[PDB]
Design a protein around this ligand. Structure first.
Ligand code: HEM
Ligand code: HEM
Lengths: 783, 788
């Protein structure tokens, strides 16, 4: 029987009904839930307890129950509304039990006051407000830094729904692009920071888009100070970071007060970097009226263009300029555009303040002179009637340095550039710094060949990357050359800058003159060089041989081999012309090895009929023979053909003997070790040079055409020739002469006991043929 | 009874225990909750259901309740923690009953699973925490506009808590203004009409302050229509203007570029201006630790202030500073303080980047824009490099004296020009190893690598003589003077060098100027010695105290004497022997080279005229002009007078020239040597020169003979290419009628092998040390032709 007293003692409401729905038990909890009294809750069936409207449904329901046959009731499992005795309606929960005994079915109902519905509804309200009219990504974290609750804005922005965002840390949840250092490590630092903190990151959503966000941690502790949870805000600063980077770049601009138009340029390209595919224009108040300050390089039409005009205002509020922007409709949000407009307007006003706040003779950066020194120097050149060739050099691709590293490294790059220019500067060449990027190089040599060489040297001096702290920014040069006779300095500077700008705009990395005719003359020289390269490539050049003979018996001493080139398109062109051109092309080694190889082959070819050919001499000084060529360039020819090695001789000048390094000295020594005779020009530089001469057996000294010339006119050179022949006779050397054309020359030269003679007197240079004819016909010309 | 199956069939968890505290009822819900099958729980004690953490403290409460006998159990009114069979923990609610039946005590327990219930509870708590951290004040409303849920932003915006304004109508709590009828009517309509309104109104706080607020009522419409809930999102439209104002003002501070400390101060004062009462401090990180940058002067204590820490980040992102702001609690909400922290952090990072940029630019800026010489930083770098090279420098500190008077009198327009031509005169006498710098104003620095005092005094003398010609400015003379302090010490760092050099600078300046000095009496006594040595040398030249010592030279195969070479000497009663290699440089420094040259030539001519008395005697005589530093205005006149005053045929004497000075340069002493050749003086050379031009000048005017320096012949035996050079020289001499001579031949082997290559005359100790002038006629006719 204890069920009744226990149930009425229990604070859970209990109602008991029989098969006829008559009530037997109704606990005081049910009494206070309904308001009726047990003397009346019986009544007729269950009429009093049920709300009057739902009444008719209830019998059929329980009828269905006694027809259902199920041992469990799925009904009343949800929340329910109960009408009280006074007609008020409250929330409640029900539970049901069906029993069978004595052939009759009874039911018991348990009732609860439902104090949890207040919690459910309050939770629904704050679930509404966490999302509604607030696109504010907020997430919350456990002590283990696990996502516990995230709102609609966060799922919408970062694509990861709550089902796919829970149970894992935010960083592991987050797809992160590879900085690779910062945007990875600082995320972990912030996510594990214990105190309030914040940072900025670049992140990738589930759609692969790049965004910039700002993440803030602020933890919360319970009463006992243990860490309960953490809360994180996820503002999207991808538009704001553009504004902040705009600010940083523009400040790095005015840090050094560049010129006015330049300042407009930084403003404009920063705006363009901020507003994609737009147009920007600026005007400033000069003399009281608006005048154009700067504009963007873009000038194409804009579809659905929207224009905003902002009047620049100073601190006092007086107008100072107008900034105008045109943007396509739908490209950017309006609020972002207006924000950019006003912040840039403020910075333009500040730039104007700096400009009118700003408003000796050498450079305090690298030490080069400033524009005043160049002006004075050119003026001192002009008054005494000398034409200076003026190169204007503009350094290019510095904008990468300025944008990526500010000015404090652009000027370091400029210093490195100036060091490289000075390292190869020649004296009388004047280097000056005009302003910022530009330089002016002044040189008095008006030769086109030298000008081309200087320009090429400058262009290629910047070939190596400019190494600045493990960051090779490549830089280029744009050179404008001006040279005209009898023109003052302003014209030269103006045309130099015009040429520099022309090269820069068309792409840079190059050079150009101003005068058009000789700017085509350089092209024609390049054409000649192309023809010469073709000729040397397909071995068309020839070697004309000129004989030199003894002055006593007339027996053949030897014959020099001289390069010659006759072209169908260009005709005869002398070696004195196409050797300097060759070194301009820098292909002298080709001519050298071809000349050597062809001479060896020709000696072999002559050997098949007559071996009596005494000696063949190649003048390597006039051929501008380099240093490293000698060993291989002689050894390959020696071994390739049937030439012995004691028949062909090589000539070297004194400057090339022991100057411009000394590796060439032993490179000639090894060639002597091969056994090829040598020939020296001056043998000077004192007793050391003489020691080298005797130690390197030369066996023959040549007298240049000039000394033999005027030999019958100037007494000093006469005595010099006596000295030379006396020294030669003393040692084991045979002295040769060049440029002999008359009879008195030969007479006096033989009078001084000069051994052998060459020139036009005996034989005009015969071509590759009719040398055996000359040798068989008139070889013993006992004159 | 039917209640046993009833409780068997309730969703409720039914358990009953008897007096023996043994469980005798268990239901499917108990199966879900406890996890133990009824076959395991029936017959088990109540302690089975008790969790571990309370087992020792289980029964006493039930004893106590039994003793009390109260029907309404006070306990189990709270939440309970139950442990499952597998060890997991869940939360359950209990409903109890005490039964006194059949003369016994029974306890009935009913267990409900509130896992959903408390999950809802913690979800509510988490959501409260989350909504409180929203940057903007937001409120929920019921259909009749019950203010049901506010958040911390709304509390910190007005003052109301959840309990204070819980469902009590907004118009009554909002404390709307009474005077503006239009404002209050519009606000009431906004609260009432169910459109998406974004109107703005003035509202009042507990401090009686009128604040602009934008309401954003956006009612919700459920799926069943008949909208119920409304959502309000108040915003402050006066804080944003203040943030923009702070941005602009701090950027204007940026643009004038004050120094680091001034800018930090302006940042903090602006922040304090925004937040009515606050203290702001800034730390800039150096080497990982924070150096104080600036804090506002309002250092008064704040009662229960709230701090805020932001980590300033560099342009790349490396942390660079800490910013801490403290404001009195309740003055501003969390959002406004966080926003000002963010805006200020960006600008502080800008200031740090600008300061770093200026540090990098100034490290290499200012290399004397006026005259172009290197400036003090360049000098410090160069001296540091020299010290790292372990090479001791000599540093001159140079100061101009009279320039300050002209500055005081004629201003800068003359001083700048004067210093300009001073530097111009200096540069005309530099050297490749000499490095000039302009430390400051009218002070300069010269750096050299010469440690011999003989060179140092000469350098100082030419520098002093730079101003021998007074500066010409606008037809006006200005005789500026110099005061120079030299420092040179091994191992001392650069700072000591500059410090002591400036000490010597001051010492030689305040004494009157126009002078030079060392700083150490340990190196100044040398120059003090040298002045009197030079005075003695001048006295000796005047009184003719010197001596001439004769060394002969004889033939290499004949044995006869070819001639004699004249050498000069000095014996003094104080300093004793003093060699020519130490008093010809001294004669140079006094500029008495002309006098000693004249004395040697005149004495040689006198000896020849005296020796002609007995017989013809001497074949030929030589004087080394190169060793005597003879100048361009000394040869012809001195030789001509020497051989005119006495009687000399000219064939007797020869002069030796190093051929280095024989170059035309700017003197053209070719005419002088040609004149000397015309008057019969023999000539001697040592090298040919550049090339054919050199041989031409050697053979045009006939150089009688050529000498091999002692350096060559001292190494002839060891090296072969010396021998080749020797044979070449001898062959050239034979060819051109040149008389090769050798100086310094010592032993017999050298003489024999030089005879093998026909050197043809030998001069050295091997036949005679240089004898005094008197023993010679006692040697010409005693040792005789030496045919060894
Ligand atoms: C004022 C008190 C009551 C109200 C307002 C009420 C209301 C309802 C309602 C709305 C349903 C259908 C949906 C649902 O179950 O949630 C229902 C079902 C049912 N009720 Fe009641 N009820 C009350 C009392 C009782 C009592 C005391 C008993 C038996 C002792 C009972 C027996 C049943 C049965 C058997 C069903 C069928 C559930 C099914 O078929 O799934 N009801 N009741
Ligand atoms: C997981 C199982 C249980 C836990 C964790 C537990 C724990 C507690 C605790 C700590 C109290 C005292 C403080 C309070 O009520 O908030 C209490 C009250 C009480 N519980 Fe338990 N108990 C458990 C099971 C039981 C069982 C199985 C019974 C009886 C069949 C029982 C009977 C009582 C009684 C009589 C009181 C004191 C009532 C009063 O003083 O008014 N408890 N329970």
């Amino acid at each position: 029987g204890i069920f009744f007293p226990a149930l009425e003692q229990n604070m859970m409401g209990a109602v008991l009904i029989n098969e006829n729905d008559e009530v037997m038990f109704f606990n005081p909890a049910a009494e206070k839930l309904w308001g009726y009294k047990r003397e009346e809750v019986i009544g007729n069936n269950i009429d009093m307890l049920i709300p009057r409207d739902l009444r008719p449904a209830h019998p059929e329901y329980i009828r269905h129950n006694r027809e259902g046959g199920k041992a469990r009731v799925e009904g009343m499992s949800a929340e329910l509304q109960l009408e009280k005795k006074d007609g008020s309606k409250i929330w409640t929960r029900f539970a049901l039990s069906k029993v069978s005994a004595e052939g009759k079915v009874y039911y018991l109902a348990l009732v609860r006051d439902a104090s949890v519905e207040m919690a459910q509804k309050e939770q629904t309200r704050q679930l509404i407000i966490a999302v509604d009219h607030l696109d504010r990504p907020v997430i919350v974290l456990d002590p283990e830094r696990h996502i516990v609750q995230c709102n609609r804005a966060f799922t919408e922005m970062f694509g990861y729904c709550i089902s796919e965002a829970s149970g894992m840390q935010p960083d592991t949840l987050l797809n992160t692009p590879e900085f690779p250092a910062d945007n990875r490590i600082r995320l972990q630092q912030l996510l594990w920071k214990t105190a309030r903190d914040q940072d900025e990151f670049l992140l990738l959503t589930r759609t692969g888009e790049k965004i910039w966000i700002k993440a803030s941690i602020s933890p919360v502790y319970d009463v006992l100070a243990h860490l309960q949870n953490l809360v994180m805000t996820f503002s999207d600063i991808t538009e704001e970071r553009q504004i902040r980077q705009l600010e940083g770049n523009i400040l790095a601009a005015m840090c050094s007060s560049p010129p006015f138009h330049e300042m407009g340029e930084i403003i404009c390209r920063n705006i363009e970097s901020v507003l994609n595919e737009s147009h920007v224009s600026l005007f400033a108040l000069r003399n009281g009226m608006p005048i154009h300050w700067a504009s963007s390089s873009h000038g194409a039409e804009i579809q659905n263009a929207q224009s905003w005009s902002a009047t620049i205002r100073q601190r006092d509020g007086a107008p100072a300029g107008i900034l105008q922007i045109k943007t396509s409709s739908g490209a950017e949000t309006s609020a972002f555009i207006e924000r950019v407009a006003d912040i840039s307007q403020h910075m333009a006003a500040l730039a104007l303040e700096q400009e009118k706040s700003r408003q000796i003779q050498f450079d305090p950066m690298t030490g080069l002179p400033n524009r005043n020194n160049l002006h004075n120097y050119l003026d001192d050149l002009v008054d005494k009637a000398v034409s200076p060739v003026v190169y204007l050099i503009g350094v290019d691709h510095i904008q990468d340095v300025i944008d990526s590293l500010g000015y404090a490294w652009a000027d370091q790059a400029l210093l490195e550039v100036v060091n490289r220019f000075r390292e190869k500067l020649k004296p009388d060449q004047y280097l000056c710094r005009i302003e910022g990027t530009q330089f002016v190089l002044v040189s008095l040599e008006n030769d086109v060949s030298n000008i081309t060489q200087i320009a090429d040297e400058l262009r290629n001096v910047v070939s190596k990357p400019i190494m600045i702290d493990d960051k090779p920014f490549p830089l280029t040069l744009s050179i404008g050359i001006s040279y005209d006779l009898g023109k003052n300095r302003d014209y030269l500077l103006s045309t130099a800058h015009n040429a520099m700008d022309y090269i820069r705009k068309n792409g840079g990395n190059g050079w150009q003159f101003f005068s058009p005719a000789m700017n085509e003359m350089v092209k024609e020289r390049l054409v000649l060089g192309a023809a010469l390269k073709e000729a040397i490539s397909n071995n068309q050049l020839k070697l004309v041989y000129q004989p030199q003979i003894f002055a006593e018996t007339g027996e053949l001493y030897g014959i020099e081999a001289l390069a010659r080139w006759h072209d169908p398109l260009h005709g005869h062109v002398p070696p004195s012309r196409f050797i300097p051109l060759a070194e301009e092309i820098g292909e002298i080694e080709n001519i050298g090895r071809w000349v050597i190889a062809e001479a060896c082959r020709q000696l072999a070819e002559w050997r098949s009929q007559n071996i009596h050919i005494p000696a063949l001499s190649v003048n390597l000084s006039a051929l501008h023979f380099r240093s490293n060529q000698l060993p291989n360039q002689v050894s390959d020819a020696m071994h390739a053909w049937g030439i012995d090695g004691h028949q062909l001789t090589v000539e070297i000048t004194e400057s090339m003997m022991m100057e411009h390094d000394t590796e060439i000295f032993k490179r000639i020594q090894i060639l002597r070790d091969m056994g090829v005779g040598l020939s020296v020009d001056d043998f000077g530089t004192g007793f050391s040079g003489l020691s080298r001469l005797v130690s390197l057996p030369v066996t023959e000294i040549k007298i240049d055409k000039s000394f033999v010339d005027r030999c019958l006119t100037e007494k000093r050179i006469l005595a010099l020739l006596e000295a030379i022949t006396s020294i030669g006779q003393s040692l084991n050397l045979t002295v040769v002469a060049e440029g002999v054309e008359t009879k008195e020359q030969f007479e006096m030269l033989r009078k001084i006991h000069c051994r052998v003679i060459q020139g036009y007197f005996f034989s005009r240079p015969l071509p590759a043929e009719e040398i055996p004819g000359w040798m068989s016909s008139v070889l013993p010309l006992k004159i």
